[PDB]
Each structure stands twice: as C-alpha cells, then as structure tokens.
Ligand binder design. Structure first.
Ligand SMILES: *[C@@H]1O[C@H](CO)[C@@H](O[C@@H]2O[C@H](CO)[C@@H](O)[C@H](O)[C@H]2NC(C)=O)[C@H](O)[C@H]1NC(C)=O
Ligand SMILES: *[C@@H]1O[C@H](CO)[C@@H](O[C@@H]2O[C@H](CO)[C@@H](O)[C@H](O)[C@H]2NC(C)=O)[C@H](O)[C@H]1NC(C)=O
Ligand SMILES: Nc1ncnc2c([C@@H]3O[C@H](COP(=O)(O)O)[C@@H](O)[C@H]3O)n[nH]c12
Ligand SMILES: OC[C@H]1O[C@@H](O[C@H]2[C@H](O)[C@@H](O)[C@H](O)O[C@@H]2CO)[C@H](O)[C@@H](O)[C@H]1O
Ligand SMILES: OC[C@H]1O[C@@H](O[C@H]2[C@H](O)[C@@H](O)[C@H](O)O[C@@H]2CO)[C@H](O)[C@@H](O)[C@H]1O
Lengths: 259, 257
C-alpha cells in the first residue's frame, strides 16, 4: 500500500556515556550552544528533538546548526530560516552516525564530561561520534552468546568466552560501546586496527574508534573503523582470546544478544 | 516449487542452522533490504511459481511430511502426508485460489474448517504456546502426529498442537535470529521446554516491527514498540539499530521512496 510514508518523531538524542544532546540553559537565542548533558525525565523542549522530513533536527522550533564546515567548529541552535540552508541538514545513519552532508563532518562530543559543547569532526567512527534517536535513556543490558553456545565474559582487564552461568551481562550504550555491566566506565576495547589485536577491557575514557562496535544482521559484531569483526581465535574457547579479524562468517564470528 | 529438507534423525545444531539458513535463502531474493534487514516479496504482482516453498520434515520413524510456506509472509499454509494434503482455511479469495497450485499430485485435498493463526490453533489444542514445549523431541512427535492424521490416528487437539510446534521451529525461526538461537539452544542440550515471554512477544510483534522499521524516519520509530525480556519484564524499542541483530525477515509493507 502506497510508498512508505516516513514520519517526524520527537525523540531524545543519546550519545557518549549515555548523555543527551542538550540546548544550553534552555535558552534559544541564535547561536546558543548544543551540549552533552545528563538526560532528563520530563518534557523540557531543550532535550527533545524532532526529526523533520527535510533532514533538519529541531528543538523547540529551532534548527541544530553547524557553525562552519571545518573540523572543530561547534554546533549551535539557530533560526532555521536565517541560517545557512545546508548547515542545518543532517542524516542519521543505521550505524549511529549523524552526518552533515556538505562537509561530511560528523556530530561529535570530544569529551565525555557533562556540559561539553558539541562540534563537528572528521568521521573516524569513534565512540565520541556515536548517537541514537531514542526516548530510552538507559543502555541495553544483555548476554552475548557465541561459539558452542558459550557466553562472552569479562574478568577485569580481559574478555573471553566461557560456559553461561545465569558477570557475563553487558550494557550496550547509545555511543556504540559495549560495557561490562558491573563497571560501566570500562569499554570492550581493541588497541589497533591490525588483523589479530587481542580485544581487551580498558577505560572508555578516550572513546576511541577501537571502542565502537555494531551488531550486524549476519550475527557479527563489527568494529566500524577497522572493518574487522570479533573473532574467537582459532575456534578454540580454551585459548581465552577474542581477536579482531576479517569477516569469513564461520561459527566463531557469529554472536547473538540474548535478552 | 523449491524443496528444502530437514530430518530430526541425526538433528544437530549445525544441521538445524543450515536448514534455517536454507529457508531464509529461499524466502527472500536479496533484492530488497532495508536498514540491513531483508524484506519478503510483495504479494501483489508475484507469479504463483515463486509464491511458495516446500519444507520436507522427516524423523527417526522414517515418517515424512511436507509443509508449504507462503513466501510473502513465511506462513505455513498447509501440508502433504502420503497421498493426502491439508490446508488451513484461507482467509480471502486470492489465497484460496493460490493454494490450488500446491500438491497437484495428491489424490485427496482437504481444507480445514479453521485458520492457521495462533489464537484458533491454541484454542483447538486446549493449550497456550506457553505450555507447549519445543525441541527436537517435540518436532519428531509433531511430524508423526502430522503424518498419521492422514491415516486417521491423530485427534484434532494433537494436530493443532503439532502445527504450533512446526510453525515456531521453522517459520518463527526463519523470521528471528533470536528465535533460531532459542531453538538451537534446545537442540544443543536436548531440552524440551516451552518458549519464554520474549519469544512469544517477538512472535506477536513481527508485523508491527516490520511496519515500524519500514516506515521509520532514518531508523527512528514514530511510536515505540514494546517487547519482553526472558524474565518477563518490558522494555521499549524506539530505534531500528537494536533490532538489526534480532529480526532476520520482514513482511513487505510499503515501497521505498
Ligand atoms: C554506516 O552506514 C552508512 C549508511 O549509508 C554507510 O554509508 C553509505 O554506505 C553505502 C554502502 O552500503 C554507500 O553506498 C554510501 O555511499 C555510503 N555513504 C552514504 C552517505 O550513503 C557507511 O559505510 C556505514 N559505515 C560503515 C563503516 O559500515
Ligand atoms: C518521546 O517523549 C516525548 C515526550 O514524552 C514524546 O513527545 C510527544 O509526542 C506526542 C506525539 O508524537 C506529541 O503530541 C506531544 O506534543 C509530544 N510531547 C511534547 C514534547 O509536548 C515523543 O513522541 C516520544 N518519542 C516517541 C516516538 O515515543
Ligand atoms: N500458520 C502460521 N504460519 C506462520 N505464522 C503464523 C502465525 C503468527 O501470527 C502472525 C500473523 O501475522 P498477520 O496478522 O500479518 O497475518 C504470523 O505472522 C505469525 O507471527 N500464526 N499462524 C501462523
Ligand atoms: O546548561 C545546563 C542545564 O541548564 C538547565 O537550565 C537551567 C539554567 O542552568 C538555570 O540558569 C536556569 O535558571 O534554570 C534552567 C532550568 O532549570 C537546562 O534545563 C538543562 O537541560 C541543562 O541545559
Ligand atoms: O589466527 C587466528 C585465526 O585462526 C583460524 O583458525 C586456524 C588457526 O590459525 C590454527 O589453529 C590452524 O590454522 O587451524 C585453524 C583452523 O582454520 C580461524 O579460522 C580464524 O578465524 C582466526 O581465528
């Protein structure tokens, strides 16, 4: 029936560390900054955004606008008509990226601190560049099951697979990071973009591109920046090592979020 | 029509995973994927020679049955056992005519008085999906029950319960990687167990999710879809990203811009 009629949902935009895209001090004068800020449970328009059909993201009637088309400029609120037309245009990608089609610069939060001003940076698929349109302020906690029915487990600085005893629970954040439920300021990290780097658990501090993942439709967990996927080294749970590796699709690269 | 076959005989996690992979492959054509999820063919304009796929199940007892699935929705519409064929009461003129092209061989074609929807099936079975166990054992039993209904040795309540099993371990499995895994778990540990609230909920929400995703604004939903966790607690989905690893197939709802 008919061609798909897309809507214009009013939603929050969660990003780095689970903070929200926020219009500073609830004021809407042209130029006021957009910032990360603890998400609120209420209806303050300064934290709610409407995804218009024309590709503009609006809060309280104004447009999320970029100051310029250069890495480093800040994002501000601005009158949609007065502002440069294609400086209020953005695309929200399935892999959590919000891009300005014109400069190809991405919405970013170069800091995980409350109150940090939003800017547009060069796309490198970092955690500092992952967002999610949702009214859901809390991260998704699940069990990741893999090879031989074993579960992904974390024991401080390392991560490996082992038999599932119902912590092996993980929190999937809006910024695209996978964090161990018991210590939410720690990220499933991968030092390099090299064909075998052993994935570990370091602090989410840098919000690096090696700390951002995406669950694909084919059952793989992809590292957007490297193009590599979580892999249980040589299908041997014993080795206790999860590595980055090119996609081939065998049972040792397939996972499932069991919720 | 294509024919995928599965046997509970030497049933294994790998054999089951290939089986489903085979079913998903025959349902979609790869031509239409949205937000990384394959969409099933549009019913309108689809020739009848590409309208159904035939799944053939066989068990230890050497008994065999062939289920027929409608490609536009992965719906089990009927089946064949021996020289007979049974169909669920079609719910619209078009479908009624379509099924006519299935199992043209058979000497005896019967059309049940009831439909294949879960409600009607649970009623007749005198059981809720929550009380009917799933697993390889239940699949074997269901195949037998299905086979003998043709000879006359299977009561209606049992027939219906058998259908609820096949529909879930095959159709619902093809539709959700989550549910396929659930079934894979049962086979792996030789467990017979009724589905959890999360499974029942995903089953009842396929249509809604297909719609929400397809007519979303860059993956954002206009209305949240509510789902359940294994323990029964609820949670709301507002975006498509979290579903990407959960739904494997979507029923066609509308055309892309
Ligand atoms: C993140 O998702 C976007 C979604 O479009 C990807 O970018 C596009 O990828 C398709 C290929 O599937 C290309 O045809 C387009 O030219 C790409 N750009 C745009 C603006 O559409 C992007 O590749 C994804 N990131 C990764 C590394 O997977
Ligand atoms: C997220 O929450 C906000 C506020 O609770 C929802 O916004 C309301 O949406 C309805 C219908 O779309 C509007 O009629 C109201 O005017 C909105 N409230 C406000 C801010 O006045 C929003 O729809 C929710 N997101 C979704 C899609 O569930
Ligand atoms: N015989 C059958 N085959 C496949 N699915 C179903 C069902 C479930 O009920 C749903 C009904 O979907 P629709 O209301 O869009 O027809 C099916 O998509 C499936 O989730 N009932 N009976 C079925
Ligand atoms: O900037 C942080 C925080 O500001 C809130 O706005 C406050 C503002 O800081 C204060 O000066 C004024 O008197 O009251 C406002 C409402 O309490 C925003 O509401 C909040 O979303 C954050 O944006
Ligand atoms: O280098 C990791 C790589 O191992 C492959 O498995 C190999 C393994 O290298 C070794 O035990 C020998 O070659 O046989 C195994 C079977 O291929 C995996 O296939 C690959 O996914 C990586 O895990």
């Amino acid at each position: 029936a008919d061609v798909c009629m897309d809507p214009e949902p009013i939603v929050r935009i969660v990003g780095r560390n689970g903070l929200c895209v926020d219009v500073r001090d609830g004021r809407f004068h042209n130029g006021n900054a957009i910032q990360l800020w603890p998400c609120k449970s209420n209806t303050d328009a300064n934290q709610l955004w409407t995804l218009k059909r024309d590709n503009t993201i609006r809060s309280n009637g104004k447009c999320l606008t970029t100051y310029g088309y250069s890495p480093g400029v800040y994002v501000m609120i601005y009158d949609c008509n007065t502002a440069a037309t294609d400086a209020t245009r953005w695309q929200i990608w399935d892999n959590g990226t919000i891009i300005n089609p014109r400069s190809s610069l991405v919405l970013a939060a170069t800091s995980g601190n409350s109150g940090t001003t939003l800017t547009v940076q060069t796309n490198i698929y970092a955690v500092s560049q992952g967002w999610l349109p949702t009214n859901n302020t809390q991260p998704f906690v699940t069990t990741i099951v893999g090879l031989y029915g074993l579960c992904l487990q974390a024991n401080s600085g390392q991560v490996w697979i082992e038999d599932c005893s119902s912590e092996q629970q993980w929190a999937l954040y809006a910024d695209g990071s996978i964090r161990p439920q018991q210590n939410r300021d720690n990220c499933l990290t991968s030092d390099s973009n090299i064909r075998e780097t052993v994935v570990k658990i370091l602090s989410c501090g840098p919000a690096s591109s090696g700390q951002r993942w995406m669950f694909k439709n084919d059952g793989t967990i992809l590292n957007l920046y490297s193009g590599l996927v979580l892999d249980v080294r040589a299908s041997d749970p014993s080795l206790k090592q999860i590595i980055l590796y090119p996609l081939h699709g065998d049972p040792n690269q397939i996972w499932l979020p069991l919720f | 029509y294509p024919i995928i076959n599965f046997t509970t005989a030497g049933a294994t996690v790998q054999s089951y995973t290939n089986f489903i992979r085979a079913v998903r492959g025959r349902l979609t054509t790869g031509a239409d994927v949205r937000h990384e999820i394959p969409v099933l063919p549009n019913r309108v304009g689809l020739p009848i020679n590409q309208r159904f796929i035939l799944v053939e199940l066989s068990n230890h007892a050497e008994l065999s049955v062939t289920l027929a699935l409608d490609v536009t929705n992965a719906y089990v519409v009927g089946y064949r056992a021996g020289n007979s064929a049974y169909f669920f009461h079609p719910d619209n003129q078009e479908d009624a005519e379509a099924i006519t092209h299935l199992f043209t061989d058979v000497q005896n074609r019967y059309t049940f008085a009831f439909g294949g929807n879960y409600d009607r099936l649970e009623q007749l079975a005198g059981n809720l999906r929550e009380n009917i166990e799933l697993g390889n054992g239940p699949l074997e039993e269901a195949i037998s029950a299905l086979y003998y209904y043709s000879t006359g040795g299977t009561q209606l309540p049992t027939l219906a319960r058998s259908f609820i099993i096949c529909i879930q371990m095959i159709s619902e499995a093809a539709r959700f990687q989550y549910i396929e895994g659930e079934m894979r778990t049962r086979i792996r540990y030789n467990r017979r167990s009724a589905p959890d609230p999360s499974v029942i909920t995903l089953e009842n929400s396929w249509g809604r999710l297909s719609t929400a995703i397809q007519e979303s604004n860059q993956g954002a939903f206009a209305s949240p879809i509510q789902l359940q966790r294994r323990n029964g607690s609820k949670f709301s989905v507002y975006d498509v990203s979290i579903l990407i690893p959960i739904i494997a197939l979507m029923v066609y709802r509308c055309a892309p811009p």
